[PDB]
Amino acid sequence: SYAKKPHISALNAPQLDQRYKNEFTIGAAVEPYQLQNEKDVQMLKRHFNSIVAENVMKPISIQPEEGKFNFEQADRIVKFAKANGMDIRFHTLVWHSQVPQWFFLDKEGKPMVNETDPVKREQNKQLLLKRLETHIKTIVERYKDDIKYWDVVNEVVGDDGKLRNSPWYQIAGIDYIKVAFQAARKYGGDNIKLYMNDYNTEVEPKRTALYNLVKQLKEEGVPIDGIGHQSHIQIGWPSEAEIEKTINMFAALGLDNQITGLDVSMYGWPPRAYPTYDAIPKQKFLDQAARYDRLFKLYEKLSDKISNVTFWGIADNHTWLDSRADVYYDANGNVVVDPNAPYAKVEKGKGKDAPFVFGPDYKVKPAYWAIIDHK
Ligand SMILES: O[C@@H]1[C@@H](O)[C@H](O[C@@H]2CO[C@@H](O[C@@H]3CO[C@@H](O[C@@H]4CO[C@H](F)[C@H](O)[C@H]4O)[C@H](O)[C@H]3O)[C@H](O)[C@H]2O)OC[C@H]1O
Ligand SMILES: O[C@@H]1[C@@H](O)[C@H](O[C@@H]2CO[C@H](F)[C@H](O)[C@H]2O)OC[C@H]1O
Ligand SMILES: [Cl-]
Ligand SMILES: [Cl-]
Ligand SMILES: [Zn+2]
Ligand SMILES: [Zn+2]
Ligand SMILES: [Zn+2]
Ligand SMILES: [Zn+2]
Ligand SMILES: [Zn+2]
Ligand SMILES: [Zn+2]
């Protein structure tokens, strides 16, 4: 948008949450250590009114051994949010990653997926579903009065448009999804909001598979209030028109929509990253700002269907996208960023992405000015 506008400190800038406070909340994903960091704390107080745990509320973080519950890190995030009037999202009750393996072992310690006896398979389904309910019950009984929004399940639809064939699904079938939502509603009451969260919600055949799944579950009386759109997107993909079609499609079923992990990568897929932040050309920041301009204009257009937009991080000095920031080198040792160009070797996850509206020195980017204005 406006590259003339200055690279001032974000702690001096107009508040992002206040700009959008009638359209949707503005959230950030955080780690407990960031609440010990003065700049991060100042950023959260100044610009955000919603919060989510990047990692410490995932299944392996909460119950890494059966009966061993570690709420100490999650509590710190809940405490900070309460002290600053922030909404809280719980990420996440059910997932196929960062999930403890003990869930999926039979009574003799052997993987349930290997069982061939159909009578024992059914016993394993019931054992897994009981473990599921106990995990959800313990968490929700603790946090039901503090956490309004819940990622009940994460990434349960595969990119091929079939249900993801995770151990959850191989062992228990579709019922693990139904049990997760029923348990959350039972122990949390009617006032918490239950979400199905996923990436590439805009992309077929996954989009229609997600649509049909939640449609059928609601018809069977499974409580589900909304869809979480992770929105791990690029400067040019997916198109705004497909984002709009996706949001409207789910709103037509009576579901809320939340943007739950927004980042706008500088790269494509698979990414060919620059090795450092300093190496990223200025022009990339301007392409990103125009994309952010279009994207938030669309979010505002649809504000009656979106209750929250959460970024998967605070500022560019910390983003999980760096773990995807592969750097390609040609035979002369020069960096290759052209996605079809020749190259000799790749250094996986050693580069730098730049996905937010706040730079790594906590100063506002062109993308910030692009979304703080009313043009
Ligand atoms: O663990 C998950 C992790 O898997 C997830 O990563 C996503 C995996 O799917 C990727 O989807 C591809 C994105 O790029 C598209 O191609 C674009 C087409 O349009 C333009 F040409 C553009 O330049 C292209 O890049 C592919 O068709 C998609 O399949 C996503 O990018 C990943 O984010 O992230 C969440 C983790 O929890
Ligand atoms: O620190 C990393 C963390 O940020 C990442 O979180 C996932 C990002 O992709 C989606 F949004 C998932 O739902 C998030 O849970 O997980 C890996 C971890 O190392
Ligand atoms: Cl990370
Ligand atoms: Cl900078
Ligand atoms: Zn505020
Ligand atoms: Zn540097
Ligand atoms: Zn709204
Ligand atoms: Zn992180
Ligand atoms: Zn700077
Ligand atoms: Zn704008």
From Swiss-Prot:
Keywords: Carbohydrate metabolism, Glycosidase, Hydrolase, Polysaccharide degradation, Secreted, Signal, Xylan degradation
Pfam families per the UniProt record, alphabetical: Glyco_hydro_10 (PF00331)
GO molecular function: endo-1,4-beta-xylanase activity
Induction: By xylose.
Enzyme class: hydrolase
InterPro entries: GH10, GH10_AS, GH10_dom, Glycoside_hydrolase_SF
GO CC term (a single one): extracellular region
Intrachain S-S bonds: none
GO BP of this protein: xylan catabolic process
Locations listed in the record: Secreted
PROSITE patterns hit by this protein: GH10_1, GH10_2
Active site location: 155, 261
GH10 domain mapped to chain residues: 10-374
Known catalytic reactions: Endohydrolysis of (1->4)-beta-D-xylosidic linkages in xylans
EC number: 3.2.1.8
Major subcellular site: secreted
UniProt entry tagged with the keyword Cell inner membrane: no
Pathway listed: Glycan degradation; xylan degradation
Family that this chain belongs to: Belongs to the glycosyl hydrolase 10 (cellulase F) family.
Name by which UniProt lists this protein: Endo-1,4-beta-xylanase
Organism this protein belongs to: Geobacillus stearothermophilus (Bacillus stearothermophilus)
Lineage per the UniProt record: Bacteria, Bacillati, Bacillota, Bacilli, Bacillales
